[PDB]
């Protein structure tokens, strides 16, 4: 019982840490990559139109 509560507080701390300091950079990488690839497909399409 007590072990579960303590570990759950610890996991809340871990989740907060990753969401505040680890999630933002990973999300930025994904957005730069996925968003960038979208932009590139778009450019390719416009160029085909040209």
């Amino acid at each position: 019982m007590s072990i579960f509560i303590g570990q759950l507080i610890g996991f809340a701390v871990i989740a907060f840490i990753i969401v505040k300091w680890v999630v933002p950079p990973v999300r930025t990488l994904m957005r730069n990559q996925q968003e960038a690839v979208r932009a590139a497909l778009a450019e390719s399409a416009e160029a085909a139109k040209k």
């Binding site: 690839v37 497909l41 390719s44 160029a47 040209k50």
Partner: protein, 57 residues
């Protein structure tokens, strides 16, 4: 492979579109100047025929 071919097309199109616009301009100019040259040759042939007829008459 998809990303690769996409890159390839972005590359070609831009190139081929640029080169084809340049080629269209160049070919229009070439055809128009060829028409002008043919017209000038025809007018010069008419001048030569006129000189020949005046001289012969």
């Amino acid at each position: 492979a998809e990303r690769e071919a996409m890159l390839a097309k972005t590359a070609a199109d831009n190139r081929k579109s640029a080169e084809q616009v340049a080629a269209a301009q160049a070919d229009y100019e070439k055809e128009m100047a060829e028409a002008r040259a043919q017209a000038s040759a025809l007018r010069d042939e008419a001048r030569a025929a006129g000189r020949s007829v005046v001289d012969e008459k």
